[PDB]
Ligand binder design. Structure first.
Ligand SMILES: Cc1cccc(C)c1OCC(=O)N[C@@H](Cc1ccccc1)[C@H](O)C(=O)N1CSC(C)(C)[C@H]1C(=O)N[C@H]1c2ccccc2C[C@H]1O
Ligand SMILES: Cc1cccc(C)c1OCC(=O)N[C@@H](Cc1ccccc1)[C@H](O)C(=O)N1CSC(C)(C)[C@H]1C(=O)N[C@H]1c2ccccc2C[C@H]1O
Ligand SMILES: Cc1cccc(C)c1OCC(=O)N[C@@H](Cc1ccccc1)[C@H](O)C(=O)N1CSC(C)(C)[C@H]1C(=O)N[C@H]1c2ccccc2C[C@H]1O
Ligand SMILES: Cc1cccc(C)c1OCC(=O)N[C@@H](Cc1ccccc1)[C@H](O)C(=O)N1CSC(C)(C)[C@H]1C(=O)N[C@H]1c2ccccc2C[C@H]1O
Lengths: 327, 326, 327, 326
């Protein structure tokens, strides 16, 4: 079946698509993040520098807005936003549903990541307990009022700007993938964390939790593991920055291997590399960066999701994977 | 129809393999609607440029029919040397007697040749354009009741590591979309057409425009061009026929090709090539200064990436559509 | 008069010189940082990855070492080092003097900034009260025992990479500059913070504290001030990093103007730019980055110090400036 | 001596100004020890490449002595057209009657000409090289008891500002250091010299090697070179005479140039130019395939940047030192 917000892609490094808010259907661009669980927009109320270029929600000219007013920090690792809670009717796709969200009023905690973004707010797409305010996930809310067949959603991401990407709600559309799905059951309903013995060419790590995260531009690994990784594969790290450079055909670059009970998952380097220079010799950025999180915890972010169509299934506690169609 | 699977190389030249000989020696070929002769490095080609190449040995094929006349191939991008021969040429699964040049002296055509990953060229041009009046391979195939139409299609892939097609005998549905305007040759020489050539301000009315798959690039009059880029933000890198600009450059116009029937247009997204993308992103521009007879334009590869091309010996036309973008 | 450690320069991006520790004169490379105030070396004792290629100080085979052993974090904004205090006699230039320093034993908090460097430790060259342990500044220490004429030091940093930099202790040598010195009284003896109305093309900020900092590769500005700056001068910021790219002759680039009661100090853009691409069009990195610190606080780091010879004067509480010679 | 201050442009070509006429029209010039004719865009040059250029108006100078014979300049990098003339040329503060080409048709020499920021070239080659046998400008100055020596020096800067020097009349101390080996011309044609040419393994004994300030680069036979770079890590960018490598590339040798007296050598640090430096540093390499008579090599700008050059009509010699590095 399925209902689909098409997602525009900027420098392969973030994705955004429209959604509406209020019964006067005020428009907004959002990052759909399977690694966070709240929704927010700039508030008509906000007076910080960053807000001033964005589309500002007016709680006023929506007739279906209801007041709440409880104040909230929202602390991503990328920065902080702050506002208060409101209730209104959010439309995603053209599915409509009441929701609790944040009218953000302070953003200085999140700029320039925000002053230089082309998105008004974020839409959380993880699980209920990653939420600030125990708010049900929007796909879940939709199910809970017969708006959707199944409380499942999918990500299809592509390979640059006027190539179009697609978040689909409540249906698993064949148009996106090839082969069959392979599923992995989650190990907490928090992030879409599943459970994996990872193998990066030379070192492996036993049963790691892998976060599948639409929100991250990059693949991440804990920092011990990475230094352990890059040594000897002629990758030069620009100094003082999470930034790794190598020749595009550096033939010492291992295919990454994600392996589970059911299945095997792989990432050729053509997937975790960015072309940066291409003039007889081609130079590349390696799209893997240090990040320390609870367990052995790796985020497969955007590079992984480019190879793999992904089905997130609230009903079963699973994420499915198939090869994404190139066309 | 029937297509030869085209190989991309830096989007700067494409090649395909085609067999010569009953013994069926396979070769790497550039298919060049800009010339009308076929050739290969003879096994008796003694020039070191020849040494990595695929040779044709007139021994191995039974069908080898001796000729021997000597011959000069004078491409503006260099010259080759040898003598004529005959044998059974095959293109995809299309076999036929043809006369061609056995190439023995590759020296006046390197470095060009010694780098290139191609052994010879095939002319997809006209009988008029041939050195030796060899009938174009398609027109032969026709008058041997071997395919429906003295026609071919050029489907070139927009992008580097993807396939590309020389279809023969009939237009295919897959390859294109929308309709298919035609225009007619103003000479049965090159696949040259008569064209109202608009380009920002600068028109140059009733130009001759050569369609040509051999050319990696688009060309213009050295004077009309130099005058064009002026005031845009396109820097020219000194004594090389090369120009860099930023890819977002908003001074950059679309290019117009209107006729009596219709209009065609080249978006800057079709005549730029990336070189560098990191924060700012620069692209090199695929239009180059080269002078000939009229206002004579070469629409090369950048144009054919946009427009599927049909080459019609029968109806004296060339015809175009939006290349199926994939 | 003066004595001088000659400083080697890597990618215009950090500078290091040799010095000795112990009475068996064990050698080490150090960053001389006028923006922190402690000395440390890797300890013979250190077993973290980042130590493993460095020259480790053996408290043992110095016959003049005295134990202390009190343990210390040292928390730069670039990272953390950890170890304990020892006393030994440190020689810089070839001036010899007793000191309290840090035997660093844990570095995992500072790597790869330390795994990818070619320097063993750091030498703090700031003021007493920036020191962990109220330790007198080395140059001060040296005065306090008749090793030097006057408790003053100088930084001469070279243009481009080769050609050699120098720190000069206890003498102002005419070989390094031209014109005359213009001095500025400090506004706390903490950093070499002086007091400045800064003027960058279009935006000015009234009476800013400027930190003169040999250690920093770049110029820094508070984040609001920067976003406010770069707008409209076609400077693209690489996404998700403190990285600013532009065309080298972007003729919108303002000369920076630092202006005080006595004096005017200036920085043409040929000083705050790093090339990156020279093919016809020509690309440049802008060596200014957002950094938020107490007041309106700017660090004039390595770019400034390339135009300007600098005299740090403990005796007067001043920093003096003259044009560095090009030869 | 007496020097003309040379201007640098992308280290790809240098230029200087020198005056022609009694009225003293100043001009931008390339000083090319690779040709021996002087020329300027006549005020009667009607070609649109002429329009930003500095023209010579044979009206303004009294001293204009009419000639008019028509003439073709056929550089290998293009051709120019005009008729001859005569007047008082000045080079720095050196004035003298000289016969030259008034250039009227620059079309066979663009885009080259219309971008270049230079109006004419001056030849600093020999009489035998001259089209019309005009005696070289230095040998004239000489034989008008106007300077001590039919000699000149070429001093060449490294960076973009930093300026260059064509000195005339005598070698200067400032410009160089150490000694000064000489070698003797194997023809009084180009300043060509006989050289045992060593380069990694590949020698090519007793080659002829042209010193030439006009050339931006160093050149070699297309075959010897192609074979050279093989197994280096030097990628060639497709059908442009252009090669990229990483600047630290350790497979890159120093070049050798030995004779009977002495040996000269080109460090990679002299024949590379940064294209890209960030994390990895890439450099484009200044050596290019071009074929002539013997093993004939053009030592151009990369070589003259290392070595100061002394050009000796009198003692038939060319001589070199380490260019005073500043
Ligand atoms: C929900 C919650 C509640 C309380 C506390 C915490 C810590 C919580 O988690 C939040 C979180 O930070 N969530 C992150 C996921 C996350 C968690 C922990 C560490 C790192 C990431 C969210 O999914 C996400 O992608 N994001 C978030 S913002 C973003 C959309 C820009 C994106 C991101 O950072 N994108 C940037 C990013 C992220 C990682 C690496 C590289 C890059 C570049 C760019 O791609
Ligand atoms: C003139 C003539 C008269 C009677 C008979 C004959 C056979 C004649 O020769 C026609 C001719 O030479 N034809 C050329 C085409 C041509 C026609 C008119 C003017 C100039 C060229 C031949 O077809 C062809 O494309 N080529 C040739 S080789 C090639 C496949 C590499 C390609 C080419 O140059 N490719 C290169 C090229 C060419 C031009 C611009 C850019 C680039 C980049 C590169 O990819
Ligand atoms: C010692 C101390 C004790 C108590 C409290 C404080 C705040 C202390 O000082 C912290 C500090 O980090 N001090 C920094 C200075 C500083 C002060 C405030 C904020 C940030 C830095 C020390 O001077 C220093 O240069 N450094 C430090 S490491 C280094 C010498 C390589 C250099 C640096 O990082 N350089 C990196 C840097 C720093 C800023 C901008 C760009 C870059 C690129 C790179 O060069
Ligand atoms: C004068 C004369 C009279 C009768 C006969 C002959 C054969 C004559 O000489 C021809 C000649 O061209 N002479 C050339 C040298 C030459 C000789 C043989 C083959 C090729 C060149 C003259 O010196 C010269 O450099 N030049 C000349 S124009 C120029 C100043 C741009 C420069 C040049 O080409 N510059 C370009 C160039 C040249 C070679 C390689 C790379 C580049 C890049 C660019 O910098």
């Amino acid at each position: 079946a399925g209902d689909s917000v098409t997602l525009n892609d900027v420098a392969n490094v973030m994705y955004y698509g429209e959604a509406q808010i209020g019964d006067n259907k005020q428009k907004f661009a959002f990052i759909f993040d399977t690694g966070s669980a709240n929704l927010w927009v700039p508030s008509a109320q906000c007076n910080t520098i960053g807000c001033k270029t964005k589309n500002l929600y007016d709680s006023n000219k929506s007739k279906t807005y209801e007041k709440d007013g409880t104040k909230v920090e929202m602390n991503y690792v990328s920065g902080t936003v702050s506002g208060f809670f409101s209730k209104d009717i959010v439309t995603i796709a053209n599915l409509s549903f009441p929701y609790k969200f944040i009218e953000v009023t302070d953003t200085n905690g999140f700029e320039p990541a925000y002053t230089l973004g082309q998105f008004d707010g974020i839409v959380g797409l993880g699980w209920k307990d990653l939420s600030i305010g125990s708010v049900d996930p929007v796909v879940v809310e939709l199910k809970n009022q017969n708006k959707i067949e199944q409380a499942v959603f999918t990500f299809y991401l592509p390979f640059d700007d006027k190539h179009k990407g697609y978040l689909t709600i409540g249906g698993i559309e064949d148009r996106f993938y090839e082969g069959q799905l392979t599923y992995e059951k989650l190990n907490h309903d928090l992030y879409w964390q599943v459970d994996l013995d990872l193998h990066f060419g030379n070192l492996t790590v036993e049963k790691a939790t892998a976060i599948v995260d639409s929100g991250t531009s990059s693949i991440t690994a804990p920092t011990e593991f990475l230094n352990k990784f890059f040594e000897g594969l002629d990758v030069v790290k620009i100094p003082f920055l999470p930034l790794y450079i190598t020749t595009c055909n550096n033939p010492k670059l291992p295919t990454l291997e994600f392996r589970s009970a059911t299945n095997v998952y792989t990432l050729e380097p053509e997937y975790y590399l960015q072309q940066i220079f291409d003039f007889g010799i081609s130079l590349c950025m390696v799209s893997i960066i240090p990040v320390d999180l609870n367990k052995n915890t790796f985020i497969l972010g955007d590079p992984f999701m480019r190879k793999y169509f992904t089905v997130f299934d609230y009903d079963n506690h699973t994420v499915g994977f198939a090869l994404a169609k190139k066309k």
